[model samples]
Target: SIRLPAHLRLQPIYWSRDDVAQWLKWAENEFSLSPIDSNTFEMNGKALLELTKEDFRYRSPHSGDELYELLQHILKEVQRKIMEVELSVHGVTHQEAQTALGATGGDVVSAIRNLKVDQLFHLSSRSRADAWRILEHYQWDLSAASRYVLARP
Candidate 1:
């Protein structure tokens, strides 16, 4: 099992799992606009965030903007690792990049412009309601999301 920092650990949440499972479940399963290894935040993650003083006060009496910042760091750190492998995109895996790399003429640049990028990029930029609306606008054919995240602009 993965270990999270104790200081990072011990917070309240709205999930049913509780404890390590809570962060683990979120790291691997929950949805965010950007990717953070939950493990990275917990002793392990990021903030790809736009939070404020009030936001922290509302999350929980037990949590704060600093904790939020630390958590955001996890996502940022994990994504930094991902960036080490490639820098032009987000929400992708190495395997997926290879697929797109070959599918689009055998280079990271080509891979960046591939269809999966568009799908992941579009999907990540919105909430469920908006994402569903975009989905309704057309059928999706991308390989995956969340697994492959890239920085844009």
Candidate 2:
């Protein structure tokens, strides 16, 4: 299975555990939720950010199943958005792209089946909009996917 690079993995070392602990203590006293443990403390940050991007930091208490669901939602959203943009540009809808690309169903199987990374890179280079669309699609799910993949090992 694919894995996240070391830098991407969440480790207490990356963020000062002391600082996190102190923050958790403050939050427990002041916030609606109470921290149960270090993991619970981590979840506080995650929930905060999900609630408000202004407090954005990497921390959260989500089960593996929750993480997977989030990933699947993100991936579907990304694919939908890309299809929307690509269709807008070429004057075709997603269904049309699927038909034209010979994709059978919801799977982008036909659209990307024979595609090579280098070919994709080349295509991305040719169209800024296309490249941005692809980047957005990838960026949307990377964090969740990384977390999901890491949890597996």
Candidate 3:
């Protein structure tokens, strides 16, 4: 079993393509715009998604906006990296996975572009830790799994 951080130990619920499509439709109806493409939904976007790693940085309170933005970036990148590995494991092409997940290459790329240097470092650290735990569970080497995990830009 993978030894995830306590905060990350919960199994992430995965939505089937059909289920995600239905949810998107519902969201579109509820919200003003069409449901964002899953692949396009960056947790870091100001409008639709928001995250920050600095939210947990200090015991004392800090700027909410800055912390939120930081967390948003971290979570989005984490989700993206996880998805990248997931696609490889399932033998799905990047395009196929993106389509199924409702994301585009542009969306993922934009998120990377928007990240602050520190945010990027945090992403790399978290992703590496998470990836290590996952691979360890399968008795796989980091070098082998990294090829698939970091395959995307």
Q: Give the count of colliding residue pairs in each prediction.
A: 26, 3, 12
Please give the lDDT score at residue 8 for candidate 3.
28
Point out where model 1 deviates above 4 Å: 1-21, 24-53, 87-153
**Each candidate's lDDT (Cα)?**
0.42, 0.38, 0.38
**What's the CA error at residue 40 for candidate 2, in Å?**
14
Tens-place lDDT digits, model 3, residues 1-153: 222233322222333344433433443454344234544322222332322334322211333333334334544665675475453334445544444333322243322222222223343355645544545554554344444445532
- The C-alpha RMSD in Å for every predicted model, in order, reads 16.6, 17.7, 17.2
lDDT by residue for model 2 over 1-153, one digit each (tens)? 113222222222222445445544443443334242556435432342243322222234423233334334434654564484454334456544544333322334334422222234453444545433454465533344334334443
lDDT of 2 at 17: 40
Q: Residue 108, candidate 1: how far off, in angstroms?
A: 17
* Candidates sorted by lDDT, best first: 1, 2, 3
List the candidate 3 regions with Cα displacement exceeding 4 Å.
1-62, 91-153
lDDT against true structure, model 3: 0.38
